């Protein structure tokens, strides 16, 4: 089978299931939604909210960027210097780990997600509590034997669309739905067994290294944000379409870093060569070949993405300041979680040339006012966004607090089983979400806490606990006993 | 009074505090004398109490110098108190003349680092400040407290044991935990000083009862 | 010719000269500038520092606020009461003066500035040391004869941009350059003859009246600051765009006060009617009509602005406290120098409603942290800023001390003739500068004095007496 699907070459026929037409989001009250409120993303031809295209068409729209021409690679000397600097810092910080067992790799996976190719069954359906059995068991055992033998396996990725709350413009106007990459159980097991040590050792130093993957906002947030606030200037590039715009060469540098620091370097070398090779994405009708972009399906991919992000930032700064990367890195504090970043630095950075180098690398940094021009740098960390939270500070220190709009949103929407009509009210009685919302509203002051408490009392009096004092829940969420 | 009002049994703590802060009866061996002022540093919680007193005094001086509300000082400042030991960081333009003057007016005896009389010095870096017998240092990995080299050599020269009369007696009793702690504290000074300390510990270890790579022990003491 | 320029009506064609592309600031050493240091403002299309807009565009950006709707006028009863209180205090304090001659008005002017319309010639070019001659002489004589006749003349103002040191964000980021109003020589002479006596009488009592125009920080500073420190609370609103936000009605009340206290009230009435009428500003291309704002070109404009500042402040305080303005003024001490203020008072002031009343009047008070909210009030005069000095006090008394950043700044930049490249080193002409800097650094202690003295020696080694700290300290404090 040959041809071209969405501008990307075709490799084989598709074994993927149909795209999901259901949502996990339920309404909390049968009352009419406020105007301008957020709703679950488009659900296909069966969605009674609008008459839109097929989900296949939306997936083609989301797959178009992966065919787009790439940007320029950073200068080779700068790239080599920054990659060496990053690797040296990780050597100085990371404690060597022992290799992961097959059982540990099998127990590291979330059993509530799909197994991917070729069975597409929820992992928990073939889980015994100790190891895998049945179809998934044979898949895992074959993957493990190929891993131990140092033999290559070709990954098969499965395309999907992300169910999430989006602004109504993404439903009633230009319809958009975010693209998700699911991976196959064999590749999941191989990547786990290979890079579990590296990712775990990186998590153990979630405070000392900019790859903030695994941090706890309530516990580890304040330290990271105080370290950021030790610096004069602060910025957030807020990239648009981060994964579609990545270059496989930068990801290869990141993967080389990840391999050189792993306890089994040859096996991780084979697994990384399989991961970073031209990827086979299953869009349902065909299995197509995606040569560029980021394959965001593997469990460790976030660390990889974050590492690549790190490299790019340093390159730009080293290209702007022309000073050594280690000097930049001791005069700066970075925070990276995939596409999300916060960059704090003492260096006087020419934001014009910084944005120029970023756009030259193929990235798409955006200002907050959505106007073209160089990026903004501010002298305070207050207001910056990281991990969907806003960075705030007071006499007690820094913290991340969810914005008020998200509070109202979680009061309007609750998660549940998959259904067809997003406006159905869930009868099945959610108090943990209410307590978390109460804390997040406590971090906004007594007024908003009083409002949210009124709404929580009104919502909990139609179903199934008490409302604490503002000061008690505030101390509970801020300083946690 | 603050400590009592915040206690779960305030009426009992009131009596206990009134007993603690009354004129104290100190037994100097020959007589039991009455000390009406000063700090009775015998009780287990006295470290908090003294520290709390320190807090009060500091805030008072700053509020006497800046004349802004104490909460304004405290949101524009960061204090660290461990009894007599303090670190004061602030964004306020502080007249160190009036600050030291108000401190000395309260009966306190603040001293410059150069041991000369005059007003206190304020610096633009936290580097060099002392807290809990440690020096505050910072690098690309963050801030930390490092024991000075003199104290390391001192703990290499002296060990704790049972009470004796001639301090120059050598203890035959063979101290691995203290030696490992010294190794860690010496790692923070660089590979040169770490090698020196490693030579000294090895030389003093062939008379009793290994020496890790510098980077490993450095990682262990910095990031555990 | 009709139309709309920068949101403001167009009246005629522009006779103004091109905007200056030069700066008076020179670097003191060829060394690299410190990061984040201040630099002369944007110099136009010829400025090699950035590729920016035309100076015409930045001037349009600065003229945009003058077309914006004004704020609300204070309550009429409050306004009348405070104006009566202010005028009565000035009557009780000011010594009556003799009218000014044409010669005195001509000799009061700064001869190093442009004559404005219609010749745009530097005053000193037609100055003999006694009177004006030539074109400027005819202009001055016509202005004087129209003054004596009680006939009106319409002033023609000339727009310009201010050469000054600005933070790099105003050059390498959003480019901004402050707007200056120059006046024409005829209006200068008329306003001088009209309000010279009043301004002189105000200068003679620069301590007892809040209009601090003419004071000397080294001589008169300590007394003013001690009387200020006699009070419990102290504040400085630190207004942004003071002149753009003014209302012509408030300026009319202030001008009525200034006229009623002048020795020639009818002629000063005519001159004020000419000054506060819709102003003709020459932006180069057109002469536009500015109906609101403050025409900041005349020699007495500083006193007028300060009087307006006084009026507005008293109005706000009386609207919040509801006590009589004279009661406020005996329970408070004000210091006004145009847009600059120091307010000391014993009244418990609700800063929320105070800031609310200020913003209702069109003013733009700003916090030190640049955050929105009510104004901050402190219990000590230390730290307050007045005339670019910080107010400090010690066992010897109060004084005004130049900030440390300003010291480093004057160490980096020196004034000289106008040139195009701000980083050219000036080859000397700074003898009276380094010693003053030495004194201002002496007021910071022996450490900062030692650092500044090292820098002064290392720079003076390019040109060729560094006293003891204590001696120069005595000289600047107690002379």
Chain B residues inside the 8 Å CB shell of A330: 139-140
Closest residue on chain B to C233 (Cα): B67
DSSP string, A124-140: GGGB-SSSB-HHHHHHH
Q: Write the DSSP symbol of residue C378.
A: B
Does B113 lie at the interface with C, CB-CB under 8 angstroms?
no
Does A256 lie at the interface with B, CB-CB under 8 angstroms?
no
Minimal CA separation from A381 to chain B, in Å: 15
Are C280 and C303 in the same domain?
A: no
Chain B residues inside the 8 Å CB shell of C378: 66-68
Chain A residues inside the 8 Å CB shell of B222: 208
- B68 and C382 within 8 Å at the Cβ level: the answer is no
What's C228's domain CATH number? Answer: 3.30.70.270
* Residues B134-163 as b or e (16 or more Cβ within 10 Å = b): bbbbeeebbeeebbeeeebeebbeeeeeee
- Per the CB < 8 A criterion, the answer to whether A144 and A189 are in contact is yes
DSSP string, C324-336: -HHHHHHSEEEEE
- A208 and B219 within 8 Å at the Cβ level: the answer is no
Does B124 lie at the interface with A, CB-CB under 8 angstroms?
no
- B219 and A93 within 8 Å at the Cβ level: the answer is yes
Does C218 lie at the interface with B, CB-CB under 8 angstroms?
no
C-alpha gyration radius of chain B: 23
Are A283 and A410 in the same domain?
A: no
- Per the CB < 8 A criterion, the answer to whether A58 and A175 are in contact is yes
Which of C56, C75, C94 lies at the terminal end of a domain, its last residue?
C75
Does C420 lie at the interface with B, CB-CB under 8 angstroms?
no
Contacts of A203-210 with CB under 8 Å at 24 or more apart are: A204/A94, A204/A95, A204/B223, A205/A93, A205/A94, A205/B223, A207/B142, A208/A93, A208/B141, A208/B142, A208/B222, A208/B223, A209/A89, A209/A90, A209/A93, A210/A306, A210/A310, A210/A333, A210/A334, A210/A335, A210/A336
Closest residue on chain B to A94 (Cα): B219
Chain A residues inside the 8 Å CB shell of C172: 350
Q: Which of A208, A330, A394 sits opposite B75 (nearest CB)?
A: A394
State how far the Cα of A126 lies from the Cα of A128, in Å rounded to an integer.
7
Are A324 and A253 in the same domain?
A: no
Are A276 and A368 in the same domain?
A: no
Are A431 and A468 in the same domain?
A: yes
Chain C residues inside the 8 Å CB shell of B95: 382, 392
Count H helices and E strands in chain C, helices first. Answer: 16, 16
Q: How was this structure determined?
A: X-ray
Minimal CA separation from A382 to chain C, in Å: 11
Closest residue on chain C to B121 (Cα): C447
Helix (H) or strand (E) holding C150: none
Mutation target vs A (from C33, C34, C172; most A CBs, 10 A cutoff)? C172
Which pairing describes strands C179-182 and C156-161: parallel, antiparallel, or unpaired?
antiparallel
A243 annotated to a ligand binding site = no
A236 annotated to a ligand binding site = yes
- B140 and A326 within 8 Å at the Cβ level: the answer is yes
Distances (CA, A) of A200 to A111, A390, B203: 19, 27, 38
Distances (CA, A) of C177 to A307, B10, C17, C57, C120: 43, 64, 18, 10, 22
Q: Which of A:328-367 have CB within 8 Å of C?
A: 348, 350
- A93 and B140 within 8 Å at the Cβ level: the answer is no
Helix (H) or strand (E) holding A408: helix A404-412
State how far the Cα of B110 lies from the Cα of B102, in Å rounded to an integer.
11
> What angle (nearest 5°) sits at the alpha carbon of residue C293, between those of residues C291 and C294?
115
What's C30's domain CATH number? Answer: 6.10.250.3230
Q: What is the largest CA-CA distance in chain B?
A: 63
Number of residues in chain B: 224
The helix/strand/coil state of C321 is helix
- Per the CB < 8 A criterion, the answer to whether A298 and A191 are in contact is yes
Which pairing describes strands C385-386 and C389-394: parallel, antiparallel, or unpaired?
antiparallel
Q: Is B40 left (phi over 0), alpha (psi -120 to 50) or beta?
A: beta
What's B183's domain CATH number? Answer: 1.20.960.20
Does C33 lie at the interface with B, CB-CB under 8 angstroms?
no
Task: Report phi then psi at C169, rounded to 5.
Answer: -60, -30
State how far the Cα of A438 lies from the Cα of A456, in Å rounded to an integer.
8
Are B75 and B102 in the same domain?
A: yes
Helix (H) or strand (E) holding A407: helix A404-412
Are A127 and A235 in the same domain?
A: no
- C392 and B95 within 8 Å at the Cβ level: the answer is yes
Does C36 lie at the interface with A, CB-CB under 8 angstroms?
yes
Are A185 and A116 in the same domain?
A: yes
C115 annotated to a ligand binding site = no
Chain A residues inside the 8 Å CB shell of B220: 95
A138 annotated to a ligand binding site = no
Minimal CA separation from B190 to chain A, in Å: 13
* Residues B28-47 as b or e (16 or more Cβ within 10 Å = b): eeeeeeeeeeeebeeeeeee
Q: How many CB atoms lie under 10 A from the CB of residue B71?
A: 10
Does A208 lie at the interface with B, CB-CB under 8 angstroms?
yes
Query: In C62-205, which ranges are E strands?
Result: 156-161, 165-166, 179-182
Q: Can you state the angle between helices C446-460 and C469-478, rounded to 10 degrees?
A: 100
Which pairing describes strands A389-394 and A397-401: parallel, antiparallel, or unpaired?
antiparallel
Chain A: touching chains (3 or more CB pairs < 8 Å)? B, C
Chain C: touching chains (3 or more CB pairs < 8 Å)? A, B
Does C35 lie at the interface with A, CB-CB under 8 angstroms?
yes
Distances (CA, A) of A96 to A200, A263, C19, C23: 10, 7, 67, 61
Which of A38, A55, A75 lies at the terminal end of a domain, its last residue?
A75
Number of domains in chain C: 4
Does A13 lie at the interface with B, CB-CB under 8 angstroms?
no
Residue among A372, A380, A362 nearest A243 (CA): A362
State how far the Cα of A291 lies from the Cα of A302, in Å rounded to an integer.
19
Residue among C273, C272, C91, C98 nearest C196 (CA): C98
Per the DSSP assignment, residues forming a β-bridge with C425 are C27
How far is C-alpha A458 from the chain's CA centre? Answer: 35
Which of A28, A49, A75 lies at the terminal end of a domain, its last residue?
A75
Chain A residues inside the 8 Å CB shell of B223: 93, 95, 204-205, 208
C236 annotated to a ligand binding site = yes
Q: Which of C380, C392, C394 sits opposite B67 (nearest CB)?
A: C380
Q: Which of A:223-242 have CB within 8 Å of B?
A: 227
Closest residue on chain B to A396 (Cα): B75
State how far the Cα of B22 lies from the Cα of C478, in Å rounded to an integer.
51
Number of residues in chain A: 481
Are C270 and C123 in the same domain?
A: yes
State how far the Cα of B32 lies from the Cα of B114, in Å rounded to an integer.
39
Are A375 and A440 in the same domain?
A: no
Does B66 lie at the interface with C, CB-CB under 8 angstroms?
yes
Are B113 and B155 in the same domain?
A: no
Mutation target vs C (from A348, A373, A375; most C CBs, 10 A cutoff)? A348
Q: Which of C378, C392, C394 sits opposite B68 (nearest CB)?
A: C378
State how far the Cα of A230 lies from the Cα of A397, in Å rounded to an integer.
12
State how far the Cα of C5 lies from the Cα of C11, in Å rounded to an integer.
10
Which residue segment(s) compose the domain that C65 sits in? 20-75
Q: How many CB atoms lie under 10 A from the CB of residue A220?
A: 14
Number of residues in chain C: 479
Chain B residues inside the 8 Å CB shell of C385: none
Are B72 and B62 in the same domain?
A: yes
| Residues sharing a CB contact under 8 Å with residue A351, sequence separation 6 or more, in sequence order | A235, A374, A375, A376, A377
């Amino acid at each position: 089978p040959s041809g071209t699907y969405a501008g990307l070459p075709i490799a084989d026929y598709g074994d993927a299931p149909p795209l999901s037409t259901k949502t996990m989001f339920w309404r909390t009250s049968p009352e009419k939604l406020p105007p301008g409120a957020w709703e679950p993303a488009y659900l296909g031809s069966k969605d009674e909210r609008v008459d839109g295209p097929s989900l296949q068409q939306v997936m083609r729209d989301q797959l178009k960027p992966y065919s787009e021409p790439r940007g320029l690679l950073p200068p080779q000397e700068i790239l080599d210097a920054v990659c060496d600097a990053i690797e040296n810092r990780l050597e100085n910080t990371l404690e060597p780990q022992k290799p992961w067992t097959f059982k540990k790799a099998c127990e590291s996976l979330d059993k509530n997600t799909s197994s991917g190719y070729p069975y597409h069954k929820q992992k928990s359906k073939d889980w015994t509590g100790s190891a895998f059995i049945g179809d998934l068991g044979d898949q895992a055992t074959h993957a493990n034997n190929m891993y131990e033998m140092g033999k290559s396996m070709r990954p098969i990725y499965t395309a999907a669309l992300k169910d999430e709350l989006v602004k109504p413009d993404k439903i009633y106007g230009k319809i958009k739905k975010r693209l998700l990459w699911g991976s196959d159980l064999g590749t999941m097991i191989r990547a786990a067994r290979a890079f579990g040590p590296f990712c775990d050792a990186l998590k153990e130093t979630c405070i000392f290294n900019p790859i903030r993957v695994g941090m706890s906002m309530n516990e580890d947030g304040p330290f990271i944000f105080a370290r950021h606030a030790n610096f004069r200037y602060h910025m957030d590039a807020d990239y648009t379409r981060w994964d579609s715009t990545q270059q496989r060469a930068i990801l290869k540098r990141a993967g080389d870093i990840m391999v050189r620091l792993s306890p089994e370097p040859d096996l991780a070398r084979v697994v990384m060569d399989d991961l970073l090779a031209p990827s086979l994405l299953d869009v349902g009708d065909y299995k197509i070949v995606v040569e560029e972009g980021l394959p965001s399906g593997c469990p460790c991919t976030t660390q990889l993405n974050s590492l690549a992000h790190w490299i790019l930032t340093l390159c730009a700064m080293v290209e702007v300041t022309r000073v050594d990367p280690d000097i930049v890195m001791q005069e700066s504090e970075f925070s990276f979680y995939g596409d999300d970043e916060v960059v704090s630095t003492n260096l006087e950075l020419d934001m014009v040339k910084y944005t120029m180098a970023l756009r030259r690398y193929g990235l798409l940094p955006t200002r907050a006012d959505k106007e073209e021009g160089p990026l903004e740098r501010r002298q305070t960390l207050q207001g910056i966004s990281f991990l969907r939270r806003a960075i705030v500070g007071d006499q007690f220190g820094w913290y991340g607090r969810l914005d008020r709009a998200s509070i109202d949103r979680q009061l309007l929407w609750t998660k549940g089983p998959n259904h067809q009509n997003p406006f159905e009210t869930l009868p099945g009685h959610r108090p943990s979400q209410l307590m978390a919302l109460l804390g997040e509203a406590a971090m906004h002051g007594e007024k908003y806490y009083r409002t949210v408490a009124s709404r929580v009392s009104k919502e909990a009096a139609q179903s199934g606990m008490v409302v604490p004092r503002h000061r008690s829940v505030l101390r509970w969420v801020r300083f946690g006993t």
